[model samples]
Structures are given as structure tokens and as C-alpha cells.
Target chain A: MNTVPFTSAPIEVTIGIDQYSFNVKENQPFHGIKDIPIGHVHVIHFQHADNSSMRYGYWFDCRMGNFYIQYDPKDGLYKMMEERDGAKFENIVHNFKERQMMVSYPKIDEDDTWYNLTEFVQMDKIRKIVRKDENQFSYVDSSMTTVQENELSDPAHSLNYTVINFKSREAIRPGHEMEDFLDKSYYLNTVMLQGIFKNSSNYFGELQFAFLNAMFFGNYGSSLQWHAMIELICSSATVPKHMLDKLDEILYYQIKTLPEQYSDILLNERVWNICLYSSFQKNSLHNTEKIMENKYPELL
Target chain B: GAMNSSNYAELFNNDIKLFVDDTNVYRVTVHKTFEGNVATKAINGCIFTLNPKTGHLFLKIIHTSVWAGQKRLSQLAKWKTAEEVSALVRSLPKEEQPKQIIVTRKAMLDPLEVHMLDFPNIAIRPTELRLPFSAAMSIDKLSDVVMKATEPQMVLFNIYDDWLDRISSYTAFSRLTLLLRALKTNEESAKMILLSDPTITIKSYHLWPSFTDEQWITIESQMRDLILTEYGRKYNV
Candidate 1:
């Protein structure tokens, strides 16, 4: 024989016009009523020493909308209210109870006769039981168990493994095994280059601003502005080293192949001074060494 | 450089203890989003802890009422929410208390700076560290910032794919992986954790304009490989 504790026993209470029986548990805290399953209700009880009590029944449903049954202390009776709005409740309980009962019925017919009436027209036993060997070409050999096991255990079979890969391919281009891995550096450099080129306009704009400052406030004012711009561009920590290298390479090539007509102005000492002032010294010693080695390979 | 499973396991276990011991400075990055609708914008935040001792990171999502947004939640309100989050951190086991907490510009606000004054035992500061790159900066620029800031013996980063989806360029996603690799190669101790939901990937794939269905699959597969090979995690999401 099993003996349940008195506190564990079910509690019967009246709320509004309905009586509810709840299996109350000891020390159960009141959470919100959102999780209460459809067709069921959660009741919370409150007790008072003056022979007064309060009970709330939160009835949940699928479509018609949820409701609450509350015990009115002032009126000495129960009152029903809509869950979403404070409107007066109606006869939704009957419909909800009907749904709750109907939910137990089978959702679909079993014998497949519901969709196919032709099958029912003929005698069931006389119907053709046509069967074919679908697995005729899919036979497996027991001798290959070791090979199967080896392949299954191989790390190549892992989700991360691939036979071929690509760092960058056009989006529309379709092929298998073009999985990209650790090629982010190539993309990162591309973005860096894009930023440098995009910001070139801004850099030139800053130079124009410096020219304006010189026009309005003399050489001292423009000097400070130019200094700021130089500082902004030259700071290795602020601007990426690779960007400066690429810019330097472009300028070097442009200066080397300058047209003779433009040489007088473009190759002027002042022009060279401006370029020198704008350019920052390379911070990476390793890169500098590589450049030196490439330029003077025989000396190395 | 060729750390076997046993060695990696030791390093991993060491990080768990390092985070709890409170001897070293740990930087925590938190990602916050609305729990339900934006109207009831309950702040659902996930906190990632990085232990410099072992180059390991850990994640924990805190869903509490304290971080909930009332209306159109203000920046000040978000900071107050962070204060509540800090309180939650304080409530953690004694050993788990961090000596210092670092947050990004979005996560940190002026109000939080003033509130952090009251707690002298732990120091909270704003960091220039933005992981997986921010839209404002290029991957190269952000990588430089990350490399300069991360001088510790170990460092961990957190990247969310949902956040990546907002980036207009698909190349940004690819560059992010490259930046991570550079950091890992530069500092062998550097590690990263990727946070994503597989369902979000499926949804984002359909919405993305630049990537075709096949390209998206390749991207997904590659990202999985990057996480497995580079980040040393079996699962990317």
C-alpha cells in the first residue's frame, strides 16, 4: 500500500462558476501561465486567515483565445475575464472542452481508402500485389566489411575534410570541392587594398584642405594641418604597413615612367619633397630586407 | 606548434581553472540581442570569457529580467542592463570572479563607466578590440588593431555568424577568417570561438544577394573546415 503525504493530495477549489481539482505540490512557486498546454488550466491558490480565499484558473486554448477565472472577494463569487483584454467572458469553455475531447480522435484514416475510392470498388484480395526487387543492383558484399570500416573511420570522411578547394572563385561558377579554408588572409589583404584606394580620395581631400588652410591662414596654419595629415598617414599603427608598401610601389613605377613633358613639374624638387613628406618609412625590417635583397641580388 | 590532443586537452583544462582562479586578467566579450520582440526587447546576452593563460575561451548566455528593454531602450538603459549583468557576474562562484572586464564601444557606455567606479575590486574598461571586424573598419585595419591590443601570452576571440550576415560584403566574412589565421600564426597562443545557429545560416543563405546557393554551400562547408582546422572545434555553430 502507498501512502501519499497530506500536502501532496489534490486540492479542490471553486473559482467563478466552475469547480477545479488540482494536484498541488509543496513549495511550488508561481510562474506565468504562458506554458500551460492547450485544453488544460493552471490554478494558483492564495489563503487568508479571515475565512476568505482567492483562486485563479488560467485556461489556455488553441484558437478562440485564452481566459482567466478569478474569485472575486468583494462580490463573494467567481468572475471570468478574457486573457488578452479585460472584456467579460462568454461560453468559450464549452467549445474549448469540446476541442479537448475531440483531440483524442485519430487524425487520419488508416486503410488508405479515404483518398482512393477505386481500391475499395474492387475486392481487396483480388488486387494485384505486384512487387519488384528494388535492391537487385544495390547488393553489398560481406568481404568488403574491413574496407567499409576503414573508410568510415578515416578522417577524410569527417565533415571538415575535402578533396579540392579554392581561395576565390566567381559566385556563378559552379563546381564541387571548391571549399574555402584559411584563405581569409587573401580576402583580408584585398579589403585592405580596397580601403587604401577608397581612402585615397580622402587623403587627397585632406591635402586640399591643407592648401585651403595655407590660403586663408598663411604657411604656419597650413604647416600644422599638413603635419596632422602626415601624422595620420605615417603612423604605422593607424594605417596598415602593406597599404603603404603598395602605394609606394605605385608611386615608384609612376615616377619611373613619367612623360617627358610632365617631367619638369612632376619631377621638381618641391614635388619630390611633398611626396617624401607624405610617405612614411617602412616599419617592417623583414620586408625592407626582402626589398633590398630583390633590388641587389648580385650583392647578396 | 604541433600540439597533440593530450597537450591541447591540458591547455584547455588549464583555461577552465585560469578563468576561475582570478589570478590573470581576462577579457570578456558579450553579444546582446532582444529576447522577444523589439517592443519588449528583453536583453538576451551571451558572455564569452578569454583566459590569456591558456589561449582558451568559454561562453555562457544569460537571460535575465534585469537586462530587459522597456520601450525603445536608450543607450543609458543598455549600460544599466550591463550593470545588472556585471552583478550577475559578481554573483558567480567566488573563484570565477574576473579581475578586470573589457567591453567594446557598443557594449560599454558612459553610465557604465560611472557605475563601475563603485566596484573597486574589479576594473571595467572599454576596448578598441572588435572581433570578426566591424563595418566601420576594414579587415586589415581591424586586424592591426587586434594584433596591437592582443599582446598577452594567450588571447581568445568570439565571432557570431548572424552578425556576419549584416555585413554587406560576403568578402568580409572570408577576410574575417584570414584575420583570425594571421592572429593565430602571429601568436601561437591565440584562439577563437565561433558562435552561430544552423537555422540562422539557412535563413541568411536565402536572403544574401551576392552568394549563389552553391557558393553558400561551399562557404558553409569551408567555414566548418576553418573552425575545425584553425579553431580546433568539431562544430562551427
Candidate 2:
């Protein structure tokens, strides 16, 4: 029941191996899909038939939203742990440099009030001299019943609740001009972001890099890297819409229905990750039981 | 975090445990042996994480020490490696090259990340050479003592502990003297091609000479005390 359909025209399917792609919105919502035989990689690809020939996948979960399919080109194949509604194909024209983009939690409306964007943003600390002169100098805090009903009632938590008047910072923008909530200056660069998250050279630093190597490399290090990558995505305005879209899908999938075997690792870094994934957590509220095996894992 | 004249090594064992467990630091070791390139040689054990945004590697060197053979190296060796260590690292394509090497001990818990190297052709190869320190001495103080001993000239190097095992034989050879020299002197040697972005270069190094005739294993407590005495002052632990 996604309002944003991937394609309006009927999408052709080939069970053997063939690449396909489609640009949406101009066309109407059309029907698409395939019946699989359990677990195996399907050599189905949706790529832009142009000079770049960028091969990618766009998976739309009936329960949630879209995803970007990547890291496959041989047969133009990609594997899905579980298939649902068909992909919402999106083709953003650009050169492929064997790279990936990870998005961070923008100032979504449901974010916890306690976490201040300015306090932790990896920007030049001195730039915010005049608070009033500062651009986008506000944080859109959580509307969750927990904060208003119980959290702010306490003194220590009341300070963060002082400001929740601002509007939400949307991910997709008309001109890529949305004021970055994490960094209001709108003049921040990538170095400062890496300087704090990547170059802090803390324990998670090493783990992040090691874990990033795996096309499917699983380890605590990889988990931390995923956390940091997403952190970088959210903190900077430099990321493009296509990049943000890919990241949004990857994060939602990883945090929501992470497998039971890897459940322990996800649980290990739950509080640590959840603190950063404010919107990612809010959007997928039902999966708390599935992800943590507890209805309200945060209370624990 | 407990510190005392006699509990140095133990402090680090706990410090390292906390450090590795709690921070986002990665451990890097020298890829292979670079011959005759004693300068910048101690970069083997370093802490760093790759920057995905810029494709730059920034290194943070906490500490470095090199073994100086007390006696003249009874042999002259040829440079088996083609280029300087710095030059070699820089040659690895711009994207992979190290863009910054900030040498300091202030940012870390334990000042040293050392390893035991297997030195071939030595008479007695028993494991020896420990990070020995003194309550009255400092890294700069000991490094100066080393320069005074060798009148050291040229390049970077870290204290190669395994070579210290040769103390009984006295056939030690070292450039830790240079490592310490470049460090205490402070500027970039004025580049002898040490790149702009270094990979955590250590300042001073010295071949800590014979403290005890007994093998280092015989008096591990003294070793602990010495390490604690030297590093504990910085933390007041």
C-alpha cells in the first residue's frame, strides 16, 4: 500500500538472468514481482540503460519502505534475505566509483530531547559564537509519550526539553538546501565529521574499519562501523538524495529485522546504536520485539 | 589506573584492556621489514583508522624506542630495501598514502605498543629487551643520553626490544638514537623525504642499557616498577 509506487507500467521479469531499470513518478503505479524457491541469489537487476549503466536494486517492503540494491554486477544479481513487495526503482545519474553512502538520523520529529545536536556536532566549536545569529539554531525533539509524560517531569531531564519548538528537517529536499540539523552552519565539510567520529581513534574506530570490509563480514567491529557510517550520514549535509535514500533503506532493514543468530551482537550494541538512531527507531517501532526479543527493550 | 614506582607494566595491562575495549582505535603494524631504513621504522605498531571521506590515513604515534648496540655493530650492512621508509609509504598511491602523522603521548593510556622481533644470525636468541624505565628519568632525558652515546646522525627508528636480548653478546645495532634525536630536536629533520602527513611518528628512542645482569624475566617486578614510574607521573595514578 505504498503511496509512492516504483513504476506505473508493468515490469517484465526474467527468471534466469537479465538486468532491468525504471525511472518513477512520471509513470503510474504498475504491478511487479517473482515467486522464489526459498534461498538463492536471483540474477535480477534494475539498472539505468545508459553510458554509466549503473546497476542497482530498489526493494519496497510492503510493511515499511524502499531500498537500494548494490554490490553486484557480474550477473547483475543481488540477494534479499526475504522478499516482499517489489522494488521502487530510482536511478540517480552519476559515475559509480565503487563506493557506498550511509545516512545519519536527521533532526526527525521523534528524536529524543536529551541529545543536543550542537553539543555533539563535529563542527568547528567556535563558529556558534552568537546563538541568535547561528543558522538553524534549534533541535526538533521527540513527541513520544515517554518524554512529555515522564522524562521531562524530572529535573535533570528538564534542561533538554527547553527547546522543541522547531520543525522537522526532511531528508529529501528540492534543492539539496535543507539546513543540516546536526551542523547548522551549513558550511561544514566532511573532514570535521571524520575528525570526530572516524579519527577519534577510539576502540570503535578500529572496529568500524575492519567490519566495513565484509560484503557480509560480521563482527562487533563491523557493527560499530555501521554505526559510525550512519553517524557520518546524519551529521553532514554533503550527502546527495540518492545516497541518503540508499542509506535510509539499509539502516531500517539492519536495525529492524536483524536475524536471531546476529541478534546477540545487535543487542550488545543496542543502547549505543539506538541512542543515535532516533528516527530509525521511531519509524520501526513494531520491530522492537523482533530486534530485541522484548517489547520495550529500552526499559531494560 | 593504579600507579606506583613498581606497578608500571601492570597499569598499562589494565590501561590497554580498557583502551582496546572502550575506544575506536585500530592497531597497525609494519607490513614488512624495511632494511637500512631505521628512520620512521618504528611506525610498525601504531593506532589509526582510515578516513572514508577523504581517503586519507592519519596516524597517531604514542611512543617509540630503538635498540642502540652498546658496542660497534661489528659488521657494516647494505640497504636491502630500495627506498626510504617514508618514500615507500608515500609511493603507495595518493589515496592510500598517510596524510598526517601526529606524534604525541598525551592522547593515549599506554605510551607503548611493542613487539618481539625475531633477529636472525644472533648468538643468543632468548626473548629479551623489555620497556625498562626509571623514576628519575624521562623519555627526553634518556633519548639525550643515547645521542650523547652515539653522536647519532640520520633517520627514524623505534627501540627494537628483541635486539636487546643480545646485551650479553654486545653485538647490538640501533637507530633509536635517531628516533629520539628527531623527536627532541622537534622539526621534521628538515626531511631526510619524511612526508608532510606522518603516521604517528615517535619522538625519542634509546637503547636502554644493561640494568640487571639477570635475564629480564628474572626481575619482572623491577621492570613493572620502572614502567609505572615513568608513565604514572603523567597520569598521577
Candidate 3:
């Protein structure tokens, strides 16, 4: 019953792929704690060479909330895997280069909470600095309960929980801009929420990536996080409309029901957390800190 | 995780047991009648798996001679009609195949993946030479010698087991030495010699002189010790 929430915003910060990018510092949300100094930003870069398209890099603001800027061609056909000559699809020779940059912010929040917006600078290099905020970031998700509850009830577990798709589907009337933003952030917030659950038997990292990819790829009607929440509500608790709407958006765009198998090869969860916590983990600093202090005091 | 000396020794011992089981035949000899000297070459070939990653190494009575002779051979067009020796070699894994074939290097100018060697040859011998050993030797002794030799011998393993360490060390010395001598001249020619597999051919010889009985025995012991120590380090048992 430990509740944790995070906010997310992935604004279209740039257009085109070959180098030049639009900045997104203003659009990013700064959590209630102000005057926070920024740390080095961590960036994740991926290229779909299968489509022979330009490489895309995602710059994550690892503070306040997960706010990101990415530039990938909206139109391109990328197949799964194809090998030509001696190089494989994911090989450096075939994959366009991905680089990360870490920049320092001038101010530090009064609460010792900050987000790294370094990646907002450029698409090259992983830099280091001194006297800067270096708060760690990670991806999280509700684990095990979804699978366990799904076994007990089928339809309840399958409920869609996305708001954007509901507007597209005429299922519910559109909410005000503030409500829409909060609802979407809540859906994204599920990542930090589930991370509170502690159990070696349950793997939170995979669930986080599953949901993150669903959001990035716009695959399922509800983000996998929302899907898990709906399953919990239907099988265990009272279901809410906001959670239902979040599920709808994730499902609307989800191409796959589960996380990609390639994510399994990574030995550590920290890497995926970097990907999942890219934008939102930074913006949700206050919420995350509160949860840590209230529920997992031992972490302090 | 990290394989060292001891694991190598244990594996060497286990490999010897497997070698004996697979190579049921005790011996095979090639006899040559010269003007005044009569020379006989006997080789016993045995097969066994080694490191889980790499498949196996086929051991013969004279490891260097068999390895070198095979490097000078080319693939047989009628593989079924080929000699037992050539056919047995063809059955080996692609990476384990010898560099040379005795015939038909002309028809297929390109090197065959299966028969190419992992290392290159640097020296050539004038004519046919008989292997100066017997196949009656068991896996236990051969493994012992392998364990004893140093890294230089392990990488090159000259037929005479001569100057093995010195030559391999030189391979890293001057860029000119490797480019002009090792790669450009000997190695390239050796590959060609392997592909042609002609009736009468020239081959590379290791740059080492003949050893006295005591010296040879000392080298063999060194080789055996090295292999045993390595095997022990990897397996712990």
C-alpha cells in the first residue's frame, strides 16, 4: 500500500535528425523545491539503421520530472533485424552513433533535490564536472502484483488506462489542460510508484522499460504501468477513471504487449532506469524524496 | 572465469584419457628409401574436445609435422577418392583445418574456409622430410610436452621444436620484419603452397637447429610442465 507518484513531459523539442536541435529547458518542469543546482545529464541514443534513417537521441532532464527532447523522423519504415555483408543491424558500423552530454546547472534546490539537464545541450560526448549536483536517477514500476492479480481475474486485469486514447476514441469528454497534464503525469508517475515495492523475487526494472517503451513507441492503449494499475484496481481495489484513461493511451500506440527481449541482455537494472527515468525521474524529485522518507526510511 | 595454469593441467590429463579412447589405432608409418639412409615416419592421430568454447585439437605422433604438412595441401575435387589422411583432415572443424592440401591448389584459387590455418607459416623446407618419431606414444606424454612448452612454442610450435620462442618474439619486433618477411614473403607463399597441394613442393621450416638428446628432453619436459600447470589453473581439479 505504499504510494509513490512521478510527473512526465516529453515535449517536441526539435525537428530533423542530422545534428542541430531545439532546446527544451523552459518547457521542463521544476519540482516545488526551487534554487536546485543541476547535475550532469545522462542521454540515451538509438538509431534504426533498418530503415536507413537518421539516428535519434533522447535527452532526459533527470530532475524535477522526466522531461525529454528527441529528434527522429516521424515517417520511416524500420524493420526488426536484417544483416547485410559482415555487419549486424545493431553493430556500430550499422547503428548510427549515439552520444550523451552532462552539463552543470548554476542553482541547487533548497531541499538538496535537482535534475540534470546536461543532455539538453547536444548529441555528443559523455562529459564530467566538479561541484555539481550528481543525484542518481533510475526507472521503476509496479511489480508482480499485476501478474498475480491477472491470474485471479482476466477482464479486470485487461482494462485500458490511458486518457489521450479516450479522447481519440470518444469514450470520455476531454478534461481541462491542467487535468490532462496531471492525468498524463500520473500515468507516467506509475514508474516511480511501483519502484517502492521491495522484493528480489520481483524485477521492477523490466516492468519499467516495458512501460517506458510502450510510451515512447506509443504502442499499447495504456502504458504498461497503467495496465498494471488497472489490473490491481479491478482485482483488488476500486478502479478510478483517470487510471483507466491512462491505460487507453498506452494501448492505442503500443505495438507490443510486453517489453522487447533485447532489454533482457542488459545485466543491470540501472541502465534501463536511465532510459525510463530519463525525463520524469528528474521532475518527480519531490514526490520520490517524500516516498523515500515516508516508506523506505532505511534508504536514508 | 579466468583460466590459468592449473586448470590447463587438469584438462590436459582429462584430454589424454579421451584421446586414447578415440584413437584406437596404435600407429601409422610412412617409410622412405634414400641413396644410403633409410628414414621412416610414424604418426598417430587422436581427437578430443578441449575448452568448451573452442571445439578440439587433433593430436598426431609428430604434432608439428602433421600440422605443417597439412598446411601445404589443397582440397580434393573428388573428396571420396582422396587418401585416408586427407579425408580425416576434411572432417575437422573449419577453424581446426590445416592450411595446406597436397593437390589441386590451382582449380580453386581462393582459400577454402574449412582448410585454412589459424596461424601463418614463416619458413620453407626444400623437399619431403620424414617425421622422426613413432605413433606408439600415448596422450599422457603428448599432453605433458604441450603443457611444458612456453607461449612462443604454443603459438608457432615448429616441427623441430627449435628457436620457437625466439622467432615468435621477433614477430612482434620490427614492423618491417613482419610485413616484408613474415606476412608478405613466407606467410603468403605458404598459403599458396597450401592451396596448390602439388606433387613436389617447397615448404617453410622453423628457424631452429637440431637439438642434442638432453636438450630435446629438457624442452619436452618444459612443454609438459607448462600444459599441466595451465590445465590445473583453469579447472582447479
Candidate 4:
């Protein structure tokens, strides 16, 4: 018989990436104009495979491979459909509690038919599109409106939405190297987009923080190319929608298949970034070496 | 005369008494002639001893006559011994010594011979039997329906405890006419007899009229006549 020990010193709990931290407060067209939120946020903590930088594997990678949970108001319901990310990605919840956040992970087949954790919390209020040029602007009108107007005419006002830019922090973390961070961001952004279908919530807030930290300072590969891919996927209406369908397909096939493909790669390439960036990592992914070098110049 | 004399044992002995009443009337005594035959074991004889004041009558047999009685008993004892040994052997492993033997012991305790001699019907039979009351009702309903009858009636036909007795009595009575004919050595024209119907419904609160003292007396007298008649046919004396 395999008996489980009831009590031993408690293991430290690692919270998955915080979703709201990513909401960056942008510069408005005017001095006090409220900034508009552009993208949906999602937070996911990828399970790691091993210490090796090259070998990738994890359960979350498998979950992403299974289905696409993206926001679609057309059906008036969150939906999921099958899709595959090859060995590049898979989606999964390492814990049962997170898994319950999904309405039906295994059974999702269409768009807007299922509800995910973020949607359960009702985060749709934070969703908006902030144009690139209208970064600094004031809203004399209600903060809810997203239409661009002359910055001078409207009185300066603060907006509830924000998205942080941590690209410059790339040199702080040793392992993520900037390239790896970009690749992991692509993976994270894709997962977030899919999650929108399942749940439209404030999931994006803290999610951007983890993504920026990992992208800039962690050991993710293909940093710039992957970042560009995320921008491209976000820009196109069809590509994201198509990828959402593929996401659902992947989730569906994963049920029929076993030992989800790309799970290992995702663990090595993605999850390792977050772990290194976490508060516990001896070499915090964000500027741990630079901070130490500055504090003890003689040691360096 | 020889066969007639051998068929019956006579009563004789001083200590024995046979009387019709407890008072001085109906008194008889033992004779020396009867004692001689009994002592020599030429034939077994019984003696009656009566106490008029106490209203008690006792029958005594000669030592030789008692010893003669033990002859058939020894045979029965051997039958029982064989059964015990057979059971023990059956329980042992197949390869062991004294292989098992299955004996039904049916023809030995022949009911015909038992009834012919007016012996007590305590002999065991080999076949399975069914009770009249149970046969009339479904097994599921038997406890509920029969238990509602008088306590004595329910106890007599108890499904769990007195099962064998209830079944045997019914079987014996149902086969009574054939059993009698079987003793007479009648080869042809077997009697077509049936058991009594158990449709006579009984209630728990009502007294058991069938098992009452008066009913028992009537049944006892009938049984005595049947036994005597059967025995008379077999013995000339």
C-alpha cells in the first residue's frame, strides 16, 4: 500500500502569475486624459519539465493544445473548439481548482458556448481598444468611451485601465535572455486570447506583468520574433479567430490522444521564465545580477 | 400351536400386576409355569405389577425376556454404528484408507415390518418430506399467515424449529392407506389415497382445536386400532 504522509513541514505555495499587474498606465495625448485599455489579459503558471533549457514539457502546454477559449460575443456565450500547437504549445491546469474555472474543458466544441474562470468573475468591463497614437489624452466624457477626440478640448482625467512596459528590463535576468522572453510572450499572449473566449474578465490585468517580466528578463527564446507574432495575431481579426478554432481542435484531439505533444517544450521554454522571475529564484529574472553588481561593486 | 405360541409373549411373575382398577377388583398374579419359560429364554414374557391404592400398574419382563428384547436393539445399534463410521470416512480425504460408502439404510428399517409388530413410529426414513401447511401456502406468505394462528398451532408447524416433525407427520398420514396395504403383502391394486387438504384456515387468536386434549384422545384411539389391526394380520397368536 502506498500511504500518503499527512503532516510534514508545509510546502511553500507558488501563486500562478498574477493577472492584473500587466495593466500599464499609458501617457495620454493630453496631460491628464485617461489612458484607454487595448488588450485582454490572462495569467497562467506553466508547469516545468526539467532544468535543461532546451527540453520542454508541462501540463498547461497540453491544455492549450486542446482547445481555444476566446471571447466571442456573436454567440452570446463562451466557447471552445479543437486546435493543435504542435510541440510548440499545450494548455492545462496543474491544479484541480484552476481546472474547475473552465465550464467544460473536455466538452467545449464551439465559440461562446462555455465559461472560463475569468468570465465567471465578470471582467468584460475592463475590455477596450486604445489606439496607438492616442496614448496621452484626457476624457471630458465618461471614462467608458473609447472613441478618439482632440486631446486639447477634453479636460485631463485618469482612466482605470493601464498596461505596463517592461521591455527595458531585459538585461536584468540572465537565463530568459531577451529572445526567450519574446518567444514565451507569444505563447502567453496566445493562451490569453484563447482564454478570452472562455472567460471575459480582468484576467489580463496582472497577466501583462508576468508576461512583460518573463519576456524581458527570463530565459525565453525567439524574444523579438515571438513578440512580433503576438502583435500580428492580435492585429488580424481572422488569424486570432482561426487560431481560436485550432485551439479548440487541439484540446479535442488531446482528449483522444495521450502524453500531450509539446508539453515538455513549453515547460522548458515558458514555465522556466516565470520560476526564475519569481521572488524566490536566487537570480531573479529581473535585474538580479545588475542590482547585486551595483550593491557590491567590489565582489564583481 | 408352535407358530401361534411364538407369535405372542405371555404375562407372568409375582412382582408384576395387571388390574382394571386401582381398588381390589381386576387383580391377577404370576404363575410358576410362565416364569419357567421366561427364565429359560424359551420365549419372552411380561409381568404386570399394580398398586390399587396409588392407582398405578407396572409391567415387568423376565431378565431373559429383556435380554431377548436387546437382540433387535443390538441390530439397530449396529445400524447406527455403520452410519457413524460412514459419515467419518466420507469426511476424510479421497486417498485415505477405508474409502467412503454411501448407504441409505432404507430397506433395513422397513416401515411394513415396524407397523406389523405395532412398534412406535420413531424409525427414521431416508427421503425428504414436505409439510401440509407449508405446501398449501407460498413460502413467502407462510410466516405471516401461519403465525397468525394460535401459539400452539404455530409452534407445532414452526417453519424454523419443528420443520421436520411437521413434514413427517403429514407425509406419514398422507401415505397411511398405502402404508397399511404395503404391510399386507398386497401386490396388485395399490390404493389411490390423498393427503388431507391444508385449506382449513387458522387464526392466531383462536385456540388450536386440532391439538386439544379431546382431539388427541380421538387420534390416539384411532392409531391404536390401526396398529392392532395391522399387527393381527401378521401374527397368529
lDDT of 3 by residue, A1-300 (tens): 010111212332322111122233323441111112235333233334233233333333334342322222363311112123233322432222222122222232452211111212221111110011232222111221233235434332232222222112121112222232213333223322344323211222223333443333332422444344323322212224444343333322221222344333211243223212442222223333344334433323
The local distance difference test score of model 2 is: 0.28
- State TM-scores per candidate: 0.20, 0.23, 0.17, 0.14
Model 2 residue A204 lDDT score: 25
Candidate that beats the other on TM-score, 1 or 4, i.e. the better one: 1
Model 2 DockQ class = incorrect
Task: Write the residue-wise lDDT of candidate 4 on A1-300 in tens digits.
Answer: 000011111211111222211111122111100111112222222221222122111101211223232223473221223344433212232222233322112222463212221222222332232222222211111122212222213223222232222222321122332232223343234343443323322333223322232332232322222233223223222333434343333223222221234233222333223332331222322342344234333333
In the order shown, what is each candidate's alpha-carbon RMSD?
A: 37.3, 24.1, 27.5, 38.3
Candidate 3 TM-score restricted to chain A: 0.22
The regions of model 3 sitting more than 4 angstroms off are: A1-300, B14-207, B216-237
C-alpha lDDT score of every prediction, in listed order: 0.32, 0.28, 0.28, 0.26
| Model 2 lDDT tens row, B178-234 | 333333233233122123335424333432333234433333333344445545665
TM-score (0 to 1) for chain B of model 1: 0.34
**When only chain A is evaluated, what TM-score does every model earn?**
0.18, 0.25, 0.22, 0.19
| Worst lDDT 10-window in candidate 4 chain A | A1-10
True-contact fraction per candidate equals: 0.00, 0.00, 0.00, 0.00
Please give the distance, in angstroms, between residue A146's alpha carbon in candidate 3 and its true position after superposition.
13
For candidate 1, give the lDDT of residue B185: 38
> Residue A33 deviation, candidate 2, in Å?
10
